[PDB]
């Protein structure tokens, strides 16, 4: 069931409904890649849900109180103080480039475990309950090897498990014992974990995984773009915690950590900033090495940072992100869409609480791989209901580098996100429809050719023409 | 069919989520008054959509553009240009104690066709399709009577006709032919029209009433609060403007008006504001005389006036309030809920574009009138689902203030009314499922009483309990 | 000495610089009326100081924090309870059409006295230290007379005083004792008072005021428009409160009063609304005969009300008008230009803290006072700096409505306000040089006599030209 | 002379006046460092205009009127419109991480050059009017040595010169000529120049640099974060533009670069952003590059960008900032301040349009350049009149990271800077007078001596005492 909004829509942005002959225009304009359409000719954009998310009113009032000094601004203050309360962390380091707060503290906690404890470069391994690409990147990069140790529920979508994000206790423990205590460069801890479309980390798994790092004496980083989506299904699912308030189950999950990397364009609510935070002075030379590198992260002065105004937002949205009956609306609506999907015959190969990964090869059998299945199913939902979805599949990994042929992919999937507070249940039943037309006219579908292609990154310019 | 939005939810305003015993200790806590409940503690509040709907980014972002200037004002410059363009108006007024722009323009007028026409105060007599109460209100003070011309099928439940708003056009000539030319200041055209729940009015109805204005040389005045609904039904249901768009519609339909008064809190999307504008030079000593008095209002000197943001957001809200998909949105999830309604067996006196009076005293058969059943109705609602309703009945109308005596009233119904782009869909089926719970449980409902009772204006502020 | 301002500008609405030839035109294009001039061609716009100022970052974050809803209102309880911890009333009525509030307390207190001390309306009296002109409108309508009782040093320009504001107390005590106190329905305290420009009422004084108005059982009403102004002179010239902060002052200057009504647009910092407040229950009855007054004011229920955002806005504004450093900082800056005016000769009939009235009869002697010298110094400032000021002589006086002839006017001034946090010292000094070229030019400014004039207001759209 | 401001000041931001006994407090628990000092503490930042300028009211306004798509936003295309425009550039590239726009273009010219002309790496040399450190610190770095080809007036205070910051011709044909063109990656015109102070480039000097590069092939970047503030000083001394409008200088003047970058944080007028764009097609390979590398900079995928609102306000401030009042105000006030310094005997090594370096050596010859006299002069300066300033001396040079000695400084200068439309000539009054002050007491302030000193960018976070 889709739960009532628990609040009042107060401000929105106009979106025109077009014609099926407009939207087979269009995409053929945008050579039938929808990276290439306009924003304001997709009714529903469920290209990403970083940043595109709406703001509460205190959340969008506090941009207006912004203290804009260089140094000792109390927006800062403001944002640090929220940081202090919520996760108990004393050291704040605010970051804008983005996601970007795992280029910094990679570089320094190798370098701390070198110095401290001879760490090993060429045999360096990190672990994970699951790495997101960008943090596997910045870790290879630097010549660290990455591992996540999930658990074995974690892809089986034919067993229901309520934990799937679940670090593999035993897995890591061996891991670190292979590789070398003094190897291990630091452990990040994904809430909710992105295994599976997004599947939470229970409590007691994060406790049982910080004791392992605990008593090897390695550095637990929370990466948590999702925290508060996790202390909901900590919740719901830990019975331990039923009880408990968001907050309280926020406090406790990060004694969990010695310090935390997050991108706030998701459960934090804005549509820019993340945070860099450690909890207590046994991390201060980390933090110090952090907030120095982070001036000379060019190997010489530059200077950047968030308005403080963005800082003021990003401050009250940490708690609004907390909201129960907010995230219990939120959830449930993710939910109702992939049950949606799931009785009208779309088949999934994963679906969590990040996104529904949809197999367009199942859905559209007649297409070959490299004809680009999942991108024609993109076109598609385009087409008739003016919706736009991203491709993981063929079209998305590209040509290998080396021989310039198509790198082979195990499955032709379409990505569907859902930008928070955003669409309704009515646009949920809106995209469920269009499914159900597309799976009705699957055999019709025609594949993709090529009329342009970029060398690199080619899903986000490349024409297409269809077969 | 509830349409899906034809916009992105961008800021909202948290409402929280609460428990039955709570709801019960809060209605009890506002003596079984939801006028006394807090703000805060309604989950769907249906007062009023007066003033309470959402506004676009655009119109938001004008409340951060305006020039404060006593006169010659850029911002009112604005306001005054959309009122041009949009209505073909050169002249205008802005008033801001809300619908007051009738205050105003009454005694203007009718010292106008008295001093012209030899108007005799005493034999004086307005037409409206349908005067709005504080229309009829300004009116019948100043010494004139009132009198609506609506058609025979205007409060038939039982037919449907396209536009119950129409005036009698056969019954205002012969009005204005038994009271005499001279004696009727000024018509009062309705769009779209107050009498049942809200019903439109067509374009060749208006240009038949101003036809006969014209020739009686009579002062029409368009009361507007819903000018783009009006227009979205004549492009829906009046066969010759199908093709045309709202605002084509719009410039049209105020071809048939000397001169137009609204409160911008409906259509025009904005939390406060009203018009008063005159269409061309014709009634240029009628403006003057308006502003004039706007300002000697009081016998003397008097300053007021919209600060200059509010005038840059109702030059943008007019326009969005034409947003075609909009309209076609916000008048479809109005019909949604009487059709659900009407299939749980909901009984409604009267149902329109404005809103929904549920008939309480046969939903509470066993409640009698004295015990106000509709406000009984509207405790349960609030009990059961947190709406908050308002009572249109017994308990409203209050005592003769000659005989202290309770005053017959002809139904107890209970008004649902729905603000612009605030609830959703699910809203809707909440709203219809609390019904659904009231309609099965009706039989134990209780009557009420006062325990404490104002000697006016009691519905704002009495005090009952359970009988 | 121009204190520097204790804020950094954060906000700005740019306007134009324009050329002597193009003001030239423009002032021919208005007429000769500066009223008639467009705010964007205005370089300093003197006109007024109501509703013009600046707000603070806070004050403009609380408009996006509005509650709409028609009761129960938590933006509406923010304000109540500003108000409650500032003034220490516990009853908050807010108002919209501006310093309407005094239409609605007048006929409720005349009411009141008269149906509880047999008050004879036909030998009703007001009393104040200064009536507002507006307060004095509402009261001489209903057939309430009024009476000033300032002190001898009130407008006495050769000697200095420190609160030339305060009540004549013995001519106070003296008129009730012949009006009889139970034909005075109440006595207004305005602060800071508007007598002489605008001067300062010490505490002792209201004390007095009060101690007598409260033997004589007389409701006695607090106009506070300019109440943070008055509470820092009392800081600054009343020795007893030296070491008091302006909240200190200002909550105890409120015991002094059963009531405040007053217009935000002052000291509140806010561009609209006003408030009615009331100390205790002592007054309950009289706050609900004003509420409900105010729905039925016309004879029957209307709906209006400020936005949420609004009462949220003023709710802040309310304390940021009383920061010390603002206060003193606006204050110093008015004396600036008074003092800069006098070094160069200009002199002034009257000069406070609201406003500088220039003597242009006697800046202009040449010009006959039929030929408006005020009018024609106002073209001449705003030919030469661009400076917008309103003439308070001939012009504004009119003509007698029963004989057409121009009303004798006892002096022809020139009114300079100044608009809060919106010009700086240089803009002073820009004023100051204005008039020292134009006292050098002096004999060469010209009359003007009318080429279109109004029958009433003739001031704001009269046209004319030189002599 | 200090022009009066050519905006009325619509929002404001408090800042508290505090006692010299506080400020004494403030400035020893700071550790006699103002970085470390609380905004709200310090009356006057003089610390950065980088971002701490004001904003008017269209460009506040714009931040809530945000398309935040990934891809295809209509504020995206706003923003590049107002390039396209104003610049007549084809191509923009939004930037967020501030300055950063060369840690991009640089890798990328570098390469382009060496694939098409055989570039050598190891010889490759890059010139500028004048480097920003930024610039030519991502230029180092790379392997690309840097060269500025500044005129012989242009650091000389004894010669008044119309245009100090530009290019040295006939240095800069020599300087290729030596390197040899095709090891000559590009060239970096900065606007206005950074060297002395801030100094502007004429036009004809573009002209003339532009040709040079043309004939031997050679990129031209326009580095312009104060692009306005060129086009202003060429307007006011460069005889052939004294009759075209800021816009029209500026459309001109990019015709003599191939590409732009710049932090939007200076004449732009926003707290954040910068830009990257190109002119035409012939540059088309590079934006692409640029572009795809500003997603795989890390050498993957990583994802950011600013927020829709923030493009939507860069593209209405890229006008504002070109007002020619405003740029004639921000200009005298800058060049005010230095005027009243320069009358009072306060000596500067060198002072233009970006900053004024007073020589604290000189005004304190008596303190050893080991006891850092510049950051004494900033104590004194925040201890006597609440200024925060920063130091350029031996304090921030910082010791030799090979033989932890401090390194030697040619000078000790305390660096003020102006934040745009923020302070008033009240302020630059203020700041005279406590330079005054300070002069008078020169031989009684103290030097400095580390209590705790970080052992990199100790000058953030160092904690000093008085010897
Ligand atoms: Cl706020
Ligand atoms: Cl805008
Ligand atoms: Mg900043
Ligand atoms: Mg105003
Ligand atoms: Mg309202
Ligand atoms: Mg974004």
Redesign the interface.
């Given at each position: 069931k889709?739960?009532?909004?628990?609040?009042?829509?107060?401000?929105?942005?106009?979106?025109?409904?077009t014609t099926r002959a407009y939207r087979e225009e269009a995409i053929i304009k945008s050579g039938m890649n929808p990276?290439?359409?306009?924003?304001?000719?997709?009714?529903?954009?469920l290209?990403?849900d970083?940043?595109?998310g709406?703001?509460?009113?205190?959340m969008?009032?506090?941009?207006?109180?912004?203290?804009?000094?260089?140094?000792?601004?109390?927006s800062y203050?403001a944002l640090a103080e929220s940081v202090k309360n919520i996760f108990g962390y004393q050291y704040t380091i605010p970051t804008?480039?983005?996601?970007?707060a795992e280029?910094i503290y990679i570089p320094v906690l190798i370098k701390k475990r070198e110095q401290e404890k001879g760490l090993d470069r060429s045999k360096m391994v990190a672990f994970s309950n699951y790495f997101f690409?960008?943090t596997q990147?910045?870790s290879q990069?630097n010549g660290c090897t990455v591992r996540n140790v999930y658990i074995k529920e974690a892809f089986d979508t034919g067993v229901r498990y309520d934990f799937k994000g679940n670090f593999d206790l035993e897995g890591l423990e061996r891991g670190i014992e292979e590789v070398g205590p003094n190897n291990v460069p630091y452990i990040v801890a994904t809430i909710t974990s992105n295994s599976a479309g997004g599947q939470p980390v229970s409590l007691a798994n994060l406790k049982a995984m910080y004791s392992i790092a605990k008593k090897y004496d390695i550095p637990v980083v929370m990466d948590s773009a999702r925290f508060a989506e996790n202390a909901y299904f900590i919740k719901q699912r830990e019975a331990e915690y039923k009880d408990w308030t968001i907050e309280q189950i926020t406090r406790e999950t990060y004694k969990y950590a010695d310090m935390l990397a997050m991108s706030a364009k998701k459960d934090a609510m804005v549509?820019?900033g993340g945070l860099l935070c450690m909890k207590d002075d046994s991390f201060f030379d980390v933090y110090?090495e952090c907030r120095?590198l982070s001036?000379?992260q060019?190997?010489?002065?530059?200077?950047?940072?968030?308005?403080?105004?963005?800082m003021e937002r990003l401050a009250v949205g940490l708690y609004?992100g907390m909201?129960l009956?907010?995230l219990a609306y939120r959830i449930a609506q993710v939910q109702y869409l992939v049950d949606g999907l799931e009785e009208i015959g779309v088949v999934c190969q994963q679906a969590g609480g990040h996104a529904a990964f949809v197999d367009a090869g199942k859905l559209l059998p007649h297409i070959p791989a490299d004809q680009f299945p999942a991108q024609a199913l993109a076109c598609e939902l385009y087409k008739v209901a003016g919706i736009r979805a991203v491709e993981i599949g063929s079209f998305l990994l590209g040509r290998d580098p080396k021989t310039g042929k198509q790198l082979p992919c195990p499955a032709e999937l379409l990505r569907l996100t859902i930008?928070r507070?955003?669409?309704?249940?009515?646009?949920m039943?809106?995209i469920i429809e269009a499914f159900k037309h597309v799976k009705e006219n699957a055999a019709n579908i025609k594949g993709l050719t090529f009329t342009y292609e970029?060398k690199?990154?080619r899903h986000?310019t490349a024409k297409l023409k269809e077969v």
């Open positions: 889709h739960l009532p909004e628990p609040f009042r829509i107060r401000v929105i942005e106009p979106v025109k409904r990276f290439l359409l306009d924003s304001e000719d997709v009714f529903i954009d290209l990403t970083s940043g595109t709406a703001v509460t009113q205190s969008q009032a506090a941009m207006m109180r912004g203290d804009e000094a260089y140094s000792g601004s109390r203050y804008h480039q983005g996601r970007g280029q690409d960008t990147g910045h990069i549509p820019m110090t120095t001036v000379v060019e190997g010489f002065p530059t200077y950047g940072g968030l308005e403080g105004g963005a609004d909201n009956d907010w930008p507070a955003t669409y309704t249940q009515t646009h039943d809106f970029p690199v990154l986000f």
